[PDB]
Amino acid sequence: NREEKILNREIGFAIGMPVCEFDMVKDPEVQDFRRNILNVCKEAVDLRDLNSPHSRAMYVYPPNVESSPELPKHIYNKLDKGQIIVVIWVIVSPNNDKQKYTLKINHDCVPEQVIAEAIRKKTRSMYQGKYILKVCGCDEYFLEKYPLSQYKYIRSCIMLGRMPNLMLMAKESLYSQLPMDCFTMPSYSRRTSTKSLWVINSALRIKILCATYVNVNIIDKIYVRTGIYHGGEPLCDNVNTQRVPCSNPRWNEWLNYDIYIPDLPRAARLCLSICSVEEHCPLAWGNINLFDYTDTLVSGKMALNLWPVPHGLEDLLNPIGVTGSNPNKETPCLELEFDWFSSVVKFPDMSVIEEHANWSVSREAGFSYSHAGLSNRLARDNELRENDKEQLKAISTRDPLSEITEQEKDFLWSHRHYCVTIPEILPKLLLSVKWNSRDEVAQMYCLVKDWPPIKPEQAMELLDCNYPDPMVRGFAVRCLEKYLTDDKLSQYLIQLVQVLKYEQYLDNLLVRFLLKKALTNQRIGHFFFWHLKSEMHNKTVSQRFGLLLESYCRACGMYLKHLNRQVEAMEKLINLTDILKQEKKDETQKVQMKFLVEQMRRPDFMDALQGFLSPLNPAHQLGNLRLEECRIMSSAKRPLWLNWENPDIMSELLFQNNEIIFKNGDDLRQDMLTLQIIRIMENIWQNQGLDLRMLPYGCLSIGDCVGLIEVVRNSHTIMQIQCKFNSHTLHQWLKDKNKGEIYDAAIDLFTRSCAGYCVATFILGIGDRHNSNIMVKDDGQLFHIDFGHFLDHKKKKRERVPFVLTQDFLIVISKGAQECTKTREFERFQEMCYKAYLAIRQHANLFINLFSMMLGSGMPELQSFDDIAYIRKTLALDKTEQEALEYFMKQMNDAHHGGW
Numbered sequence: 035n036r037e038e039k040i041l042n043r044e045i046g047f048a049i050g051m052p053v054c055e056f057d058m059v060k061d062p063e064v065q066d067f068r069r070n071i072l073n074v075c076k077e078a079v080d081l082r083d084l085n086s087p088h089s090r091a092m093y094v095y096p097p098n099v100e101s102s103p104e105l106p107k108h109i110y111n112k113l114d115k116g117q118i119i120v121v122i123w124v125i126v127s128p129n130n131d132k133q134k135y136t137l138k139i140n141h142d143c144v145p146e147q148v149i150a151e152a153i154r155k156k157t158r159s160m161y162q163g164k165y166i167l168k169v170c171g172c173d174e175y176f177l178e179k180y181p182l183s184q185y186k187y188i189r190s191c192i193m194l195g196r197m198p199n200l201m202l203m204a205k206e207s208l209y210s211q212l213p214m215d216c217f218t219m220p221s222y223s224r225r226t227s228t229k230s231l232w233v234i235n236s237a238l239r240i241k242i243l244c245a246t247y248v249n250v251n252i253i254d255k256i257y258v259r260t261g262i263y264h265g266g267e268p269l270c271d272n273v274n275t276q277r278v279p280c281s282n283p284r285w286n287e288w289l290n291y292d293i294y295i296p297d298l299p300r301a302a303r304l305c306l307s308i309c310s311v312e313e314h315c316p317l318a319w320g321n322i323n324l325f326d327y328t329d330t331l332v333s334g335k336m337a338l339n340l341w342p343v344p345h346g347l348e349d350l351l352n353p354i355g356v357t358g359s360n361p362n363k364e365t366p367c368l369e370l371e372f373d374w375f376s377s378v379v380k381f382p383d384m385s386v387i388e389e390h391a392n393w394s395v396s397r398e399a400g401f402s403y404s405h406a407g408l409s410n411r412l413a414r415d416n417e418l419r420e421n422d423k424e425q426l427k428a429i430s431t432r433d434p435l436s437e438i439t440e441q442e443k444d445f446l447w448s449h450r451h452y453c454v455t456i457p458e459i460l461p462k463l464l465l466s467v468k469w470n471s472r473d474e475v476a477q478m479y480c481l482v483k484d485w486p487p488i489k490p491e492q493a494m495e496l497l498d499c500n501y502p503d504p505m506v507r508g509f510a511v512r513c514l515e516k517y518l519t520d521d522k523l524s525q526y527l528i529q530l531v532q533v534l535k536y537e538q539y540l541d542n543l544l545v546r547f548l549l550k551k552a553l554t555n556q557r558i559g560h561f562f563f564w565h566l567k568s569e570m571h572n573k574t575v576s577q578r579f580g581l582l583l584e585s586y587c588r589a590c591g592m593y594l595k596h597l598n599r600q601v602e603a604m605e606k607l608i609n610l611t612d613i614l615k616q617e618k619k620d621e622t623q624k625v626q627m628k629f630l631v632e633q634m635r636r637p638d639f640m641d642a643l644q645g646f647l648s649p650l651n652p653a654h655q656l657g658n659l660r661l662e663e664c665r666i667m668s669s670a671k672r673p674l675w676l677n678w679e680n681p682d683i684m685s686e687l688l689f690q691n692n693e694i695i696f697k698n699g700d701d702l703r704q705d706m707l708t709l710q711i712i713r714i715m716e717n718i719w720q721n722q723g724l725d726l727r728m729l730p731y732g733c734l735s736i737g738d739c740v741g742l743i744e745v746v747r748n749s750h751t752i753m754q755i756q757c758k759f760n761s762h763t764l765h766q767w768l769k770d771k772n773k774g775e776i777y778d779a780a781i782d783l784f785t786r787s788c789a790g791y792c793v794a795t796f797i798l799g800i801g802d803r804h805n806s807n808i809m810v811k812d813d814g815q816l817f818h819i820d821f822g823h824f825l826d827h828k829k830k831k832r833e834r835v836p837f838v839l840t841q842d843f844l845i846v847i848s849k850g851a852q853e854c855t856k857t858r859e860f861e862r863f864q865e866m867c868y869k870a871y872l873a874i875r876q877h878a879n880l881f882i883n884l885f886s887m888m889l890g891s892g893m894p895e896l897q898s899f900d901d902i903a904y905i906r907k908t909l910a911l912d913k914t915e916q917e918a919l920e921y922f923m924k925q926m927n928d929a930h931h932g933g934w
């Protein structure tokens with residue numbers, strides 16, 4: 035047991051709460067999750083010891099590869115006849131003397147071939163399966179047989195015109211360093227009648243007894259508002275209790291609902307709230323799953339602790355809110371009573387559902403012309419015309435925020451069998467289902483059961499708040515299991531972690547998929563841990579995320595120990611910054627720095643703040659902290675500028691110092707999402723041969739309004755440039771930094787990165803640009819920082835241009851010409867914008883879905899589908915492609931007072 039106790043201390047330190055608190059949770063769902071999730075843990079551990087040591091090395095150091103080995107024409111043209119120059123370093127003599135070997139090989143060469151060529155060059159100077167290639171300066175390895183150019187490091191080197199520097203390491207040098215972890219099963223591994231829902235011939239009714247902890251200001255009259263929901267879709271009309279004074283919240287009233295108990299869908303929920311009053315106002319709210327995790331209908335007495343109303347929610351009910359009782363018991367508590375049927379009621383099995391769907395399909399197949407004429411949801415098989423097929427195809431092209439009329443819904447449902455031939459229509463077909471009809475739902479189940487697979491980015495939509503059904507969500511997860519690459523999983527990890535909150539139960543297919551991937555890929559596992567840990571202060575998700583983190587920490591292996599180093603380093607940094615903002619806030623920079631350096635030099639702190647992996651990128655080792663290079667930044671919330679040595683043997687070939695900005699006080703979640711979207715945008719542009727280089731620098735939220743920002747070396751704000759001022763200062767600075775022949779490359783890089791940031795900021799509705807949030811690298815790469823604001827943040831009770839190209843920017847674009855607006859350079863720059871704008875337009879659904887998946891997150895500027903609709907306005911989705919280009923030009927023309 036000594037091993038178990040110690041490991042529980044390690045897991046508790048990682049999660050930020052003791053494991054014993056989980057053991058005390060009475061709720062059977064919680065204890066069943068803890069026990070049953072362990073098979074995902076076992077499965078993942080089995081996959082890792084399948085082909086050991088190689089399979090273990092693949093888990094710890096997965097290949098950091100692109101999704102496809104194909105190169106866009108513009109990237110291939112950067113290669114000398116499809117060949118790349120590569121530098122291979124062999125550490126040999128004592129005191130680690132470095133021998134370099136320059137190779138000109140095909141871009142498609144496998145690491146083993148690269149090693150053979152290196153051995154050839156070293157032998158000419160006077161086995162291949164005994165070495166591995168490592169990226170110089172960081173812990174990135176090439177353990178798998180992918181073409182060299184498919185490795186992200188290599189592709190980046192090709193794209194940026196950089197020399198790839200790789201190090202020949204012995205297989206045994208790496209293998210001996212990966213410890214053998216023996217995953218142990220925890221102590222908790224060792225643990226009337228029953229009627230079907232469809233045999234309950236009764237209407238729904240729920241009793242509202244009384245409310246406790248209704249502490250309000252003498253508010254002069256209150257009631258309970260209730261409704262039956264399927265996602266955010268009401269299943270019947272809302273039912274309110276009679277009004278009562280808040281001084282005595284007693285109702286003892288059965289509420290009768292307009293729904294037959296057998297018609298209740300699987301994901302049906304009771305959404306309620308205590309309202310005051312005419313200006314009706316919600317005081318507290320709470321949601322409940324009408325069926326528990328065991329598929330049992332709610333029976334008996336239940337007490338539900340309510341949640342405080344979130345600012346901006348005028349609506350009396352909160353359906354897209356969290357389901358379950360508030361963990362804090364010193365909150366308004368509502369007592370409810372459910373119906374009793376003298377037996378346990380369960381949701382029918384798939385076999386019963388299938389028998390019923392086949393019975394319905396067969397019955398409908400025999401319907402006469404006139405019977406089918408009774409309903410617009412009924413359509414005879416052979417009546418399917420080509421015009422109808424064309425209408426179905428047109429509907430499937432519409433964006434997820436485009437309204438589907440009641441007529442289109444009846445249309446889609448009656449043609450559901452033809453819909454299988456155009457499988458991407460599934461999200462529209464599902465919103466057209468009468469979720470309060472068991473006859474229709476049973477048939478939808480069977481259609482989904484055998485539904486053709488759709489793209490992972492299309493399936494992701496089916497995991498958002500509009501799709502609560504577990505059969506639907508199960509199909510989505512299966513598409514991800516079959517077609518989502520680890521690369522794309524990493525890219526969309528924030529969205530996939532968010533959509534976990536929309537799950538009715540702790541144990542589901544999505545969490546099993548995500549956990550298995552985190553436990554079989556340490557790069558995925560790293561960010562999985564941090565995304566969950568960053569939200570552990572949020573009581574809406576702390577039990578879910580806490581239980582998930584416990585399962586992750588039991589099976590991740592040795593990485594727990596490394597994570598605990600990063601957790602301890604962040605904890606010390608939160609502690610220091612918290613003191614500086616509450617105890618030393620008014621003191622000078624010189625004084626504050628003296629306190630900081632004295633605190634940091636304490637042996638306990640000094641050890642905790644050095645020799646750990648960067649949470650921004652775990653391939654980066656943070657060695658000794660360079661205190662003399664550290665500083666308190668004069669910016670808002672006084673962030674810490676931190677500098678560590680990169681202890682890697684060949685750090686000089688990557689970077690010798692790792693500089694990170696630690697910030698305590700601002701919410702960094704909107705920045706992370708924007709930075710992710712900028713990268714996705716750049717990826718779309720690059721694939722279409724549209725070379726607009728963006729700078730989606732690293733940003734990670736590690737807690738409540740705490741996080742890390744990746745520093746971009748040799749980059750300066752426009753204000754830093756002009757504060758050496760004329761409009762020619764910037765262009766003169768770039769000319770000075772790019773003297774000679776290389777000048778044109780800087781102007782091209784500037785105009786290209788400028789076009790990208792113009793289009794990206796206009797689409798996304800980012801916070802207003804100024805000379806302190808626009809940065810420029812010495813080579814001419816323009817980029818933006820501080821993405822705290824996006825979408826419709828300047829809304830009133832209509833669209834903006836956040837990046838207005840002042841004379842300074844146009845002078846650079848036009849190479850110093852006076853009439854910068856009327857030059858061929860500016861005409862070429864406009865063309866880059868138009869193409870960039872239209873390309874994003876073609877991928878609008880992806881962007882709409884990425885934002886829709888982030889709705890359950892507590893982001894201030896992303897609270898409703900109305901906020902996402904801003905992107906539907908900027909992309910001009912209701913207009914044609916030419917009208918959309920015209921609208922963009924007009925927005926640009928108005929903001930710049932001419933030119934477009």
Ligand SMILES: CC(C)[C@@H]1COC(=O)N1c1cn2c(n1)-c1ccc(N3CCC[C@H]3C(N)=O)cc1OCC2
Pocket residue numbers: 667669673695697731743744745746747748749750751754809819820821
């Ligand atoms: C104060 C800080 C938190 C700001 C505000 O919100 C951001 O997003 N910020 C940010 C991002 N980046 C940098 N600031 C940054 C700052 C300075 C430097 N540089 C590098 C050279 C010296 C220093 C400078 N220009 O002062 C480089 C940076 O990288 C881009 C990411």
